[PDB]
């Protein structure tokens, strides 16, 4: 029920075409898909440029983690990438990934917080590290 | 013929035009499919196993979509105010064990230490490093929760030293004590650990380790691959891990390389058969040519994606039959030779043209008609294989008469002795025995007739798991242990099934892709309010709770709406059942807000599901559960008639609705039953098809009919008898198999089929004499071809799947089979009872 240290879920490559599928390219300000991503000024969450599709999954997994924790609430601790820090690919290039923790970045915490991140409809989801989790989306 | 004659003669002309533009529109449509489209890929086998199109297709897509189109998004939503504004478990890897001398229970010492050692073996290795997780943030590899540490650890020495001779005992007195001092679980994990097989004599060990489940770990799969780790006492006899789906791949992977091999053995044996291996390079690249040709029809042309591997198969398939027309060719061109060139060549051909032509035919008209199924991956393999085989046809009539052509224009002994010798001993062995073969056939053949039919039918499985190695692997090992234990149950998940009307039931999702469905849409004779309506919602809900599996909280909604109701004020106080509809949905969203926010707040989903049409409110459809008297199982008819007889009743109250509420449906996760009643259905189907398609081919041909008649008994029983030589095997139930029967046709046609032309062909009259002709100038090139077919299928064998050493099996035991059948048993039919100067002829 909580989620463990290197689960993927599904138990595939994240690119599997339904779980979050292969990257689509970066986003640049000078790119026009830049265009289309989104930021999360959502108050209840802590940065903010993310994914339409990670809009969706990020908006859903908010409340259902404060009815999760009480004083703790929807901390992100990395949204979106231009800087060059994630690899030579991430979704992070294209505000669909995001690595992810509480505000109050407690590790053995996360196992369930993933839980409830597919609670929310996510697409893909790992307690990849104790610093953090991953959690994903596929293609819009 | 004449233009027909002139095309014979630009065959005797102008060779290399064609070779080389053929080659050209090959390699064109080959990099075309190869670029343009990309290399299918599987991460799993467990696709398009569906059966769309069908009404529980409708049922089951509707449901599943609309599922995931529930709250997530639209304004289908659970709350119509949230419109408004360190222990293990099962995800840790483990290993099943035993102790394979004196084969007692593990209970004792001496494989206590046994283990020790295994243990120190175990997590020796680097690569487990990699992945140990020292936990505890002090890079300490995180301790095995394990038995001798269970017992160093309420011992305070350390595991190995625990000295059995009495902790052995006093723990299983705690054990025996035990049944629910506590100390802290360890009693009850591990009760997790083993099975109900002790309450003495575990018959197993087992390990866990503080690790990940994942396919991450596939190198220290290999790592253990190599290690044993069952020095003396003991057996690692069943491990459980996530890495399967990819081994898969990897094999087939090994395999393909391992087939080009059986390719070879048949390219040698024929450049032998010529001596003349330009040829066999020839028929070779001709192969891999029309299998990228086809391809091309696949990806690019019709513009295919999802390219199941089992397709595959056609390979294995295709080499036993492309090399058939070749010693059926080179036999006339020696005869003809032994009594300018481009007449000798049209007639030659003349002769072939039937023989090649048909059975081609039959062949690809059965793997085609696979079509008609109600499957996904069937239709990719019959389309594909269609399409390949029509192509090798082409390829030879066209591409190969050239082979001839300059094979010449470039211009042991033992051998020849051995193949007189051998039709001559053979036609003796029937010219002095004639009725031996008959009866002891006719025997068989009923014999596997009551085989298959009366007695040991060919019953279903119901542990589906869709095996896939050898029976015997550690990952089947693990396969039959699970219910054998405790964390393993669903007291069990009795059958709840759900019943519902508001939405439409259909699936337009693309049949070919398993990841296309489509849409839902909405059934609105629905009206949500009406009264009479209303009405018999209740009566309806009075009504099964008049069952017996009627089997017994937002159930049955309209309760905790009347109680809000007649739940009096400080508008929805103080009220009955029949009333408005607006003042209805008006009142009804808050007091659902209300069981919502209650501490019942029971996880559900039976009852409402609405939309923003206060906000204006509504719901779009609803729902309602129930338990039934049963529970889960893998059986056919006991589920099977429980959804007959319930869904019976449906009807029986459905149109006693006002139509109104003739707008639902009925579930249960029949899928798997699903299957094993189509299944079936569309095979004989199928089997069927192909069976009238040969059919009308035996009577296009050779017209007289005493000839078909006895070829379909031949080949008939040859069914039978292979059937129930799987059954000597003793298989279950899948697809793949009615696959192969579907085949079984198209396959063993032709050597009759060759036969009775000849014959027909030959210009005697007589049984024996007729016959010894057809004899002398049909027999062996059959035999090379069956021969082909043997070695590609029996070279499957000795490898790691069910498909592909099934599939050798499939091969060789019906062609050499159908082979022997038509091979003596019509030979003796004939040698007595042919037709005779003009008789039965049409
Ligand atoms: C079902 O039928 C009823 C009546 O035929 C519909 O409702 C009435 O119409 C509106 C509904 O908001 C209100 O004026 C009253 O509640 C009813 N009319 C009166 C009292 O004159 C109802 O909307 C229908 N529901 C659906 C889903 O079609
Ligand atoms: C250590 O020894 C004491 C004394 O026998 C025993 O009570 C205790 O259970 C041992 N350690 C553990 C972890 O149980």
Redesign the pocket.
């Given at each position: 029920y909580p989620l463990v240290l290197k689960q993927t879920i599904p138990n595939l490559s994240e690119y599997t075409n339904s779980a979050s599928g292969p990257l689509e390219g970066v986003i640049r300000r000078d790119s026009p898909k830049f265009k289309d991503l989104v930021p999360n000024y959502n108050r209840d969450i802590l940065f903010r440029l993310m994914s339409k599709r990670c809009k969706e999954k990020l908006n859903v997994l908010a409340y259902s983690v404060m009815n999760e924790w009480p004083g703790i609430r929807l901390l992100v601790t990395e949204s979106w990438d231009e800087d060059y820090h994630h690899g030579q690919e991430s979704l992070h290039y294209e505000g669909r990934a995001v690595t992810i923790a509480t505000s109050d970045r407690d590790q053995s915490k996360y196992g369930m917080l993933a839980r409830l991140a597919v609670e929310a409809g996510f697409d893909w989801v790992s307690y990849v590290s104790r610093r953090h989790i991953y959690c994903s989306v596929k293609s819009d | 013929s004449e233009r027909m004659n002139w095309y014979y003669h630009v065959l005797a002309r102008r060779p290399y035009l064609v070779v080389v533009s053929i080659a050209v529109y090959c390699v064109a449509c080959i990099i075309v499919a190869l670029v343009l489209n990309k290399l299918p890929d599987f991460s799993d086998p467990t696709l398009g196993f569906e059966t769309r199109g069908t009404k529980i297709g409708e049922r089951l897509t509707a449901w599943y979509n609309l599922l995931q189109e529930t709250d997530h998004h639209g304004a289908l939503f659970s709350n119509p105010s949230d419109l408004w504004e360190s222990s293990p478990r099962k995800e840790y890897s483990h290993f099943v064990v035993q102790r394979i001398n004196a084969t007692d229970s593990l209970f004792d010492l001496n494989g206590l230490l046994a283990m020790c050692q295994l243990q120190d073996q175990i997590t020796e290795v680097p690569s487990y490093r990699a992945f140990c997780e020292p936990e505890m943030l002090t890079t300490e590899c995180c301790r095995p929760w394990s038995l001798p540490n269970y017992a160093a650890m309420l011992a305070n020495k350390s595991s190995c030293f625990d000295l059995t001779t009495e902790d052995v005992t006093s723990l299983h007195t705690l054990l025996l004590g035990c049944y629910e001092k506590r100390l802290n679980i360890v009693f009850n994990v591990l009760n997790f650990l083993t099975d109900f097989s002790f309450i003495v004599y575990l018959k197993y060990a087992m390990i866990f380790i503080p690790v990940a489940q994942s396919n991450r770990l596939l190198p220290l799969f290999h790592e253990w691959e190599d290690v044993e780790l069952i020095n003396e006492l003991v057996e690692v006899v069943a491990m459980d891990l996530g890495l399967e789906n990819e081994l898969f791949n990897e094999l087939l992977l090994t395999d393909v390389w391992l087939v080009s091999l059986g390719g070879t053995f048949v390219m040698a044996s024929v450049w032998l058969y010529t001596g003349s291996a330009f040829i066999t390079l020839m028929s070779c690249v001709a192969i891999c040519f029309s299998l990228g040709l086809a391809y091309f029809f696949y990806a690019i042309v019709l513009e295919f994606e999802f390219f199941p591997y089992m397709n595959l198969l056609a390979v294995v398939v295709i080499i036993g039959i492309g090399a058939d027309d070749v010693f059926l060719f080179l036999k006339i061109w020696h005869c003809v030779l032994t009594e300018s060139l481009e007449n000798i060549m049209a007639l030659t051909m003349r002769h072939a043209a039937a023989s090649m032509f048909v059975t081609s035919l039959t062949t690809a008209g059965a793997f085609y008609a696979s079509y008609s199924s109600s499957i996904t991956a069937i239709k990719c393999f019959g389309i594909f294989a269609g399409t390949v085989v029509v192509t090798n046809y082409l390829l030879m009539i066209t591409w190969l008469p050239a082979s001839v052509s300059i094979m010449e224009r470039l211009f042991k002994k033992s051998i020849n002795r051995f193949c007189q010798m051998f039709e001559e001993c053979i036609t003796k062995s029937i010219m002095n025995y004639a009725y031996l073969w008959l009866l002891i056939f006719g025997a068989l053949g009923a014999s596997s007739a009551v085989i298959v039919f009366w007695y040991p039918g060919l019953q279903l499985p119901e542990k589906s798991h869709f095996q896939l190695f050898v029976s015997k692997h550690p990952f089947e090992v693990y396969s039959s242990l699970k219910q054998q234990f405790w964390f393993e149950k669903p007291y069990n998940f009795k059958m709840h099934m759900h019943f519902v009307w508001g939405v439409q039931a259909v699936d337009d999702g693309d049949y070919t892709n398993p990841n296309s469905y489509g849409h839902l849409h909405y059934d609105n004779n629905?009206?949500?309010?009406?009264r009479p309506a209303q009405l018999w919602i209740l009566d309806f809900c009075q009504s099964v709770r008049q069952q017996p599996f009627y089997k017994e909280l937002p159930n049955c909604f309209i309760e905790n709406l009347i109680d809000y109701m007649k739940r009096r004020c400080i508008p929805c106080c103080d009220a009955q059942f029949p009333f408005?509809?607006?003042?209805?949905?008006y009142c009804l969203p808050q007091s659902i807000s209300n069981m919502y926010d209650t501490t019942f707040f029971r996880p559900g989903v039976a009852g409402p599901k609405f939309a923003e049409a206060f906000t204006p409110l509504?719901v779009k459809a609803l729902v309602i559960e129930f338990e039934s008297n049963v529970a889960y199982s893998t059986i056919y008819a006991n589920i099977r008639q429980f959804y007959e007889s319930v869904e019976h009743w449906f009807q029986m109250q459905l149109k006693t609705a006002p139509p109104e509420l003739q707008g639902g449906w009925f579930t249960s996760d029949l899928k798997f039953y699903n299957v094993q009643d189509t299944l079936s259905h569309d095979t004989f189907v199928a089997i069927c098809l192909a069976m009238a398609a040969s059919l009308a081919v035996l009577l296009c041909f050779t017209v007289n009919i005493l000839i078909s008649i006895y070829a379909v008994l031949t080949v008939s029983l040859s069914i039978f008898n292979t059937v129930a030589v799987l059954i000597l095997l003793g298989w279950q139930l899948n697809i793949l198999e009615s696959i192969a029967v579907s085949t079984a046709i198209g396959l063993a046609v032709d050597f009759s089929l060759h036969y009775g032309i000849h014959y027909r062909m030959s210009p005697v009259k007589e049984r024996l004499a007729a016959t010894q002709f057809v004899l002398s100038r049909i027999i062996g090139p059959t035999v090379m071809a069956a021969t082909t077919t043997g070695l590609a299928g029996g070279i499957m064998m000795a490898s790691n799947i069910l498909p592909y050493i099934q599939i050798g099996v499939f091969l060789v035991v019906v062609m050499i089979v159908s082979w022997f059948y038509a091979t003596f048993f019509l030979m003796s039919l004939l040698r007595v009872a042919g037709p005779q100067h003009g008789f039965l002829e049409l």
């Open positions: - | 629905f009206n949500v309010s009406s408005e509809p607006h003042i209805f949905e509504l």
